[PDB]
Amino acid sequence: SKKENLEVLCPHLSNFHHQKFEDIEIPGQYLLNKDNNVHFIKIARFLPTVDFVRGTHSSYRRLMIRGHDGSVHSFAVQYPAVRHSRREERMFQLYRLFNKSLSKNVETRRRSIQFNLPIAIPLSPQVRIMNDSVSFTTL
Amino acid sequence: LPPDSPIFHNNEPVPFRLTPNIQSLIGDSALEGIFAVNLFTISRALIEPDNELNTYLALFIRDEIISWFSNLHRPIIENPQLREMVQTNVDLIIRKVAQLGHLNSTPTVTTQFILDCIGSAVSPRNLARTDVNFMPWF
Amino acid sequence: NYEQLMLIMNERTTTITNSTFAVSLTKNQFSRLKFIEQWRINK
Amino acid sequence: AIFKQTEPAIPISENISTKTPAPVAYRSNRPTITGGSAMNASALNTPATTKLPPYEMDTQR
Amino acid sequence: NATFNEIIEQELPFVYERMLEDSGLLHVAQSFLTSEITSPNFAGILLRFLKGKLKDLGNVDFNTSNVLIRLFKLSFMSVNLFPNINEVVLLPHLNDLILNSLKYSTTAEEPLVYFYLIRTLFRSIGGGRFENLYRSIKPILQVLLQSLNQMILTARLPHERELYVELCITVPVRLSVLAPYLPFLMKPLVFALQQYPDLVSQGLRTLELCIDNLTAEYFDPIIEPVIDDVSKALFNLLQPQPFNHAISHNVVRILGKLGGRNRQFLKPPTDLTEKTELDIDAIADFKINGMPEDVPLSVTPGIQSALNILQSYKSDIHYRKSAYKYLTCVLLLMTKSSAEFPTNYTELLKTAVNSIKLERIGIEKNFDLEPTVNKRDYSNQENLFLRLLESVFYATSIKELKDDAMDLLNNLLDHFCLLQVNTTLLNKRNYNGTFNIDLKNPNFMLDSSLILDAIPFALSYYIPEVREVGVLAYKRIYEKSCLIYGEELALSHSFIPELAKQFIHLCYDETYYNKRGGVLGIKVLIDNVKSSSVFLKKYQYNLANGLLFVLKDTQSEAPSAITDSAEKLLIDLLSITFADVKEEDLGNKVLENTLTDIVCELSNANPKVRNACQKSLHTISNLTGIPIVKLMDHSKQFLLSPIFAKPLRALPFTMQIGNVDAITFCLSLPNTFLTFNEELFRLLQESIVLADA
Amino acid sequence: DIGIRKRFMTILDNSLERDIKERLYYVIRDQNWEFIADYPWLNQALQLLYGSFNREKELSLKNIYCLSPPSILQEYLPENAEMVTEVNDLELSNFVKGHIASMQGLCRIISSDFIDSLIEIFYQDPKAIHRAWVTLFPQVYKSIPKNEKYGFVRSIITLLSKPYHTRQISSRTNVINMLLDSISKIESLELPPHLVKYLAISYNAWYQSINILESIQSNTSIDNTKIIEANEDALLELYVNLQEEDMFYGLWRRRAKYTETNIGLSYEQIGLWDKAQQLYEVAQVKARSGALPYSQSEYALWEDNWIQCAEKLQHWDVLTELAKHEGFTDLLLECGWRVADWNSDRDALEQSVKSVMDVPTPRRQMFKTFLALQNFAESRKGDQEVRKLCDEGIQLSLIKWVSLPIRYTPAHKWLLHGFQQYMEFLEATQIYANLHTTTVQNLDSKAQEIKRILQAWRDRLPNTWDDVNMWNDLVTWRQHAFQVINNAYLPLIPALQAYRGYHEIAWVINRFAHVARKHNMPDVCISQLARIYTLPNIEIQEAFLKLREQAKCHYQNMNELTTGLDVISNTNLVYFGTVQKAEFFTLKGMFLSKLRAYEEANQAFATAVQIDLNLAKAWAQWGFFNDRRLSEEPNNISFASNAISCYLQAAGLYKNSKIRELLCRILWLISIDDASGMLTNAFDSFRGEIPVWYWITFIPQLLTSLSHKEANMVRHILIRIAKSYPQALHFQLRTTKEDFAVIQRQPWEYLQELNNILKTAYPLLALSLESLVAQINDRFKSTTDEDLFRLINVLLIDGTLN
């Protein structure tokens, strides 16, 4: 089944927004260096019917999160995340640090050049969540 | 460098991945006017701002050096000699980046080193000398 | 035949003003480089 | 802080009456940047409504 | 005036009931309040009469609602006709008018009359002083307007979306720009510019009021989540002179007042269309007389157009009937290559249905691979069949298209009932060997489980005349599944278990349409299956949690019949499943969990689910002879220990209310929970003794 | 009206023959669609072609792999099956056979009902006509045999070149789009004459033509070398009309024959117009006296791109006499020509406008509107036809906007600039009308409106990466509008007895002279700081940006730093400010440290930093100077403490900026292994508020710094992060805490201290985040088949790798 229910899989996250009593933010908004803090998107609720995605060499589950501004953010749960994730995320951090030099130069700003890194935020040192929309493919 | 371990080198025959299928997707006009020119202007924009490449690449190389000496179990080489390893690798990476965005004093086509690189990354005499998991046909 | 069919509208236009005059009157060499050279000589 | 002063109020018209221009048989085969025009805007130096230029087939009897 | 007031106050109900027969008598009341020295007095009498008549403004017929709306319109025009003479008659019961319209539209039968009244009140004023007592209502009004603006994902759309976006913009304010509650206006501004060409000249004006005096620092992060939609709808309004220049030169003035700010927030396009099921080709062979062989061309070049023809109630009926015939042509072409049946299908169906009750069916093993699925084309064909089936369901909402739609729907439903037995027979490939890898499967087809996405679509749809067709569809597949299986196993292997799980999943969705579809499916399910005590007692915990989640999660502006029907269904289900329990200490696995989920929710933030849990604890202590304090013997600590641990000072208000209400219900019970909660009483009395400023 | 329409179409169908070739030749050659020319007639054309079909009851899809049939699926019960033998006494047995007989007649689909039910979809929606034509026409083109394709493609050119298509110009769904799209799906006739495709741009058809013109670049159509170059000409002109310049430069230097053309086009794409201009001159010289024929298309490229580079470099005195040498509206494009009057030669511009303001463009219409505005300006009680010329210009620009594609192209940016120009024309009308009634010396009563509109103009300027022609056009026409008010306040100067003569032209010079320095044009950035001497007084803000930009001019091209040294070192009189001398002194520090100088540059930075202690650029440059002195030695010398102190001072009041490289320098210079505690003193004696929010982006490099020794000054930063921004640290803290907890002292002690500070302050937040993370960690664990799948995949890639 390509679409499995969240309240069957994890009933705490389908019941989250009732027993939540503060403003949690969407994780991974501090990695993208957006100067202030007031316009960050707060998690409204977890959507039901999460997706089971079979890849080429593995498979994972994609859970969707409704934001407080009406937007839906999809994340991929890599449950056996391989232990070279810290080197990956440090390269992601390094190449996201260069995106501000690539917007003050006029020639890279006319052509709208940015580096487009993925936002992967680790939860435990076994599981990380990565941003993953549908209509992402590999070659 | 009196030590010898970290170098940050590339093993592949091709300088990057520009396979036949990607090159037929991008085309001829966009490979000449969009691919190479953006690849030139990125490296031009990174060496302009008066050593920001140095400041980022220093600690982001140093963590890689520490992980390199901690993966293999010899973490005892902790000294300013490690800072010499870091500065050597940083100068190597900065030299290879500034090689792309250098326009000559003589009149020469900008994106010429980049065009020679894409000439050496798409030739079948280089793509055949790589592994089959690279999929050089695709 | 075919080569004369595939070039029916291939008529060159020097400039917008000449195109304007050509469409207006129907209803009613390296001189540039030489000019730039002689103007650089005159200064 | 939150508010700035009053902008100049530009009064748009209420009963303007312009003419829709007739199409023109324009011709521009220059392939250079600025399209054989003084400036390179290429949207400001192009007529509004155009049509196809006159041509003729092979008059080879 | 002092005698005319008591004459008209004693006579106004009789004048009103005379207005419901001869409607010209409105010209009486108009002539009392359009030109008088005693116009504020009659405006006060009329407003105090209409304040009482407002509660039944929704639940009356067309004539009475028309008369009441005209009296309200006259009473509002009397205000802006005499501004310096008393408009102070309107400023009391003005916020009560807004609030009671929003509250009474919940339980109303025709709930759009209240928002038409709010629109008339907003269009009657603007340019006055009493918009400062109204500024204490703006956040509640704008949250109730945006959460009614986008929650109509199945919007009725006569003017419903237009009405809500007309209400959300064009709210009055004495200040030039309205409030810090401007991000509430950004989502209706996109709809006002984009989709309704009669709202456009309103919304453009709102943009100018934000662009002219907002400092361009405070305003730019506000329009940031909507700047691509705003600029893309603004660029559609840049059209020449046959299009209206009064709303094109507005856009030119806006984009000229923004220097580089009209183009500094646009990136390369992230909205490239990727050829969905309304864009793909389903190719068949056609015999053309000028050709030697048949030629393959697509049967679906006009599917999106025919769907837009069928959904619109302003086209012809010839065009609508031909569109329906086209969609059923494409659907029956997709259904044709499974509509052939073998010569011995009856004995094969009987063999395959009594072969389910056997254990250890031997599987012949073979070693050969099957081709893969090609998920994109499978998903497009699956969604295409789903859209065509949903339009067959929608076609029953139209007169003179209903009879053949119902006949074709009956044929399709008892076709899918006969095709479900193949899925049942192939689900025994998941058994008979805990890890078999050498078996044979038919490769990849539309698995006849897409009636599990069409019948919950028909129940969640915004026309009730197709929700009736959805429940008739469920009754028909119940009859056919009980026919071809038998009642003892149609509740464990046919559609009836599977689709029932779908109904529980409709209770967890994020809009009130799907919750109504879920409680509709649950009510027809528990009206069908009551003769057997294995299904409703096996599925009791999940059904109770679904009907409880309808009570917890439902927005306040959703209609009242959702939570009322959910409460009635929960009480009826607990009356059914707790009828056989006679032992006072009888709980094995699932009665313990049902009582746990009930009594752990007496301390909720929502008062509806608190009162529903109290009522359900009362109707299962009057059903069987068990005290309420015997029902809470095992799960009382899971209710009390979260309350006694948190000190009731850092919690928000709705949780303090829930904890205090749960402890009040526990203390009102006979002789239980007397132990050492003095610290909570001391902290609550010291939290209520002080001021709240 | 359905009855008469159906009767007309059925007698037109019965008149023709039932062959597809005859009906295709009827809809292309024979029928004259000039009367139905506003309506999509392809509808009617489809109704003729669908007349040639057969009514076949065996219509069946072959592409869908449809739903599960009961034929083979009741044979998927392999050997354990007690087959029942003729049980026929039920209600099931008649229901099944009645359903079989029902579904037999229901799924017999003829071609007739599909065809004639699709026909009436065409009369409501014109997008079923588009899709139906694009699916049908490449299939019925196969009926046209060989030795007849030439006449068919010639009839296609005759159909597309008809003059009655102008009744569908103002539409997004023309028949030309619906027909060119079906041309593009054929690849046999998909070469039409291809200057027709570039001229079928009177319609929209942009990408329907780019598809056709790019499917000849990748076709073996090499019959001529003059078909290919004309194809490339039409493609480059479509790229120019869409302002897609990168594809223009790529296609040009893929097709060019000279090498200096390639070098000049590359320098022109980058934005170096001096070297590109020199290379175009070299390529023009070698064609006069060479052995190459230059193809008559590179020659125009050399001429026009020379003119464009000379326009960007602002050599208007050359181009004025170049446009005097030949009849051209390059002469009109010196609207800014080092001009202060525009009135002594008013007639010489009116005749040049009026001779060319037929077949009008938005630019020449803008020139006509500016002439009317100047007529209202220099002669009060003017015309107020400016309110009419602006409106006809707005309507012309709207026709040009609808002629472009729907989605935003780079060509729309100039239309947006034209909208801003018309709105500034109307505001200049208001300014001049207020300027004509202040003749009674009513100053400080109507000057407030002028100040408000000028303040609105100061904040309304283009983006800094926009074209320098856009910036130059806005600057020149604002200089015209300022010259009018400076001329009209000129009689009212001595009758006042600072003053209301503004001359804030310097602002729109300085803001221009800044942005050209952003565009790497230093020659015009020096040359624009010479039109500032029109008034000999030293102003509080003209001298500020003037001296700052002139000192920033001489910062690169290191044979020029002495020219920045000698201009600041002799200027000691204050130009209305005590902050300008501090930046002067630290610029002396930059210029002295750029050459090899050890102590005097340190003295220059010291005297730059003692005066105010409020310029963070001086602290940042002193830190850079100390790092440049550090780079010739190992980093363990206590001289680095001065560097980290100037860096920490350079991040405290340099806030809301790019300060993260200073934080990188702090994190790298702190990590030295000095035994003397001077660096910890230099960190811990910093008097100022540390930028806690900008330390978030190095939270991993802080959290791995606790494991490294000589780092407990990282703890103050992490504590100030955890008490103010608690959601940034939480996931990283739990991840590295459960990393260090399973490998088991200051690392875990510091991690438990940070976790305790994050748990006491904000306890509800930590509780909810830990419950969320724990539920994801326990419930999203993969099943058995997914683990087996990933195990077999890693085994298979290792087997094929070994």
mmCIF file of C-alpha atoms in Angstrom, chain A residues 15 17-21, chain E residues 548 551-552 595-617 632 635-646 648 651-666 680:
data_model
loop_
_atom_site.group_PDB
_atom_site.id
_atom_site.type_symbol
_atom_site.label_atom_id
_atom_site.label_comp_id
_atom_site.label_asym_id
_atom_site.label_seq_id
_atom_site.Cartn_x
_atom_site.Cartn_y
_atom_site.Cartn_z
ATOM 1 C CA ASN A 15 -3.120 13.519 17.982
ATOM 2 C CA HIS A 17 -1.879 19.454 17.832
ATOM 3 C CA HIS A 18 -4.395 18.895 20.630
ATOM 4 C CA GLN A 19 -1.841 17.952 23.294
ATOM 5 C CA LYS A 20 0.649 20.489 21.925
ATOM 6 C CA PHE A 21 0.542 23.652 24.012
ATOM 7 C CA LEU E 548 -13.926 10.677 19.393
ATOM 8 C CA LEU E 551 -15.347 15.528 18.487
ATOM 9 C CA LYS E 552 -11.822 16.639 19.424
ATOM 10 C CA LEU E 595 -12.768 2.822 28.879
ATOM 11 C CA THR E 596 -9.175 4.087 29.021
ATOM 12 C CA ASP E 597 -9.595 6.290 25.953
ATOM 13 C CA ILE E 598 -12.907 7.590 27.291
ATOM 14 C CA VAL E 599 -11.805 8.421 30.830
ATOM 15 C CA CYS E 600 -8.416 9.780 29.804
ATOM 16 C CA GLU E 601 -10.243 12.465 27.799
ATOM 17 C CA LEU E 602 -12.320 14.102 30.532
ATOM 18 C CA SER E 603 -9.497 16.667 30.800
ATOM 19 C CA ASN E 604 -9.469 17.853 27.207
ATOM 20 C CA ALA E 605 -9.155 21.395 25.946
ATOM 21 C CA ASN E 606 -12.398 21.116 23.985
ATOM 22 C CA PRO E 607 -15.609 21.159 26.064
ATOM 23 C CA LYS E 608 -17.571 19.117 23.516
ATOM 24 C CA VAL E 609 -15.433 16.014 23.961
ATOM 25 C CA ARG E 610 -15.467 16.500 27.756
ATOM 26 C CA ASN E 611 -19.266 16.541 27.855
ATOM 27 C CA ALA E 612 -19.399 13.647 25.384
ATOM 28 C CA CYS E 613 -17.093 11.541 27.570
ATOM 29 C CA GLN E 614 -19.203 12.380 30.635
ATOM 30 C CA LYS E 615 -22.399 11.445 28.783
ATOM 31 C CA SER E 616 -20.877 8.220 27.493
ATOM 32 C CA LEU E 617 -19.758 7.292 30.996
ATOM 33 C CA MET E 632 -12.502 3.938 36.552
ATOM 34 C CA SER E 635 -7.406 3.856 34.062
ATOM 35 C CA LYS E 636 -8.034 6.473 36.744
ATOM 36 C CA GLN E 637 -4.318 6.964 37.378
ATOM 37 C CA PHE E 638 -3.679 7.757 33.702
ATOM 38 C CA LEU E 639 -6.280 10.517 34.073
ATOM 39 C CA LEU E 640 -5.212 11.899 37.450
ATOM 40 C CA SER E 641 -1.407 11.646 37.404
ATOM 41 C CA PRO E 642 -0.926 14.115 34.488
ATOM 42 C CA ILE E 643 -3.123 16.579 36.398
ATOM 43 C CA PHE E 644 -1.498 16.286 39.828
ATOM 44 C CA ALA E 645 2.042 16.532 38.406
ATOM 45 C CA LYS E 646 1.774 19.745 36.391
ATOM 46 C CA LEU E 648 -1.528 24.399 36.754
ATOM 47 C CA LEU E 651 -0.378 25.525 31.244
ATOM 48 C CA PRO E 652 -2.557 27.506 28.808
ATOM 49 C CA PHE E 653 -6.140 28.366 29.678
ATOM 50 C CA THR E 654 -7.924 25.564 27.818
ATOM 51 C CA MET E 655 -5.882 22.965 29.671
ATOM 52 C CA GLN E 656 -6.479 24.584 33.050
ATOM 53 C CA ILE E 657 -10.211 24.563 32.243
ATOM 54 C CA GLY E 658 -9.968 20.917 31.223
ATOM 55 C CA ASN E 659 -8.077 19.820 34.335
ATOM 56 C CA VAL E 660 -10.463 21.670 36.660
ATOM 57 C CA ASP E 661 -13.517 20.266 34.833
ATOM 58 C CA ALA E 662 -12.160 16.707 35.032
ATOM 59 C CA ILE E 663 -11.494 17.032 38.760
ATOM 60 C CA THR E 664 -14.973 18.536 39.240
ATOM 61 C CA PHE E 665 -16.532 15.526 37.512
ATOM 62 C CA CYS E 666 -14.382 13.167 39.591
ATOM 63 C CA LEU E 680 -4.178 22.268 43.824
#
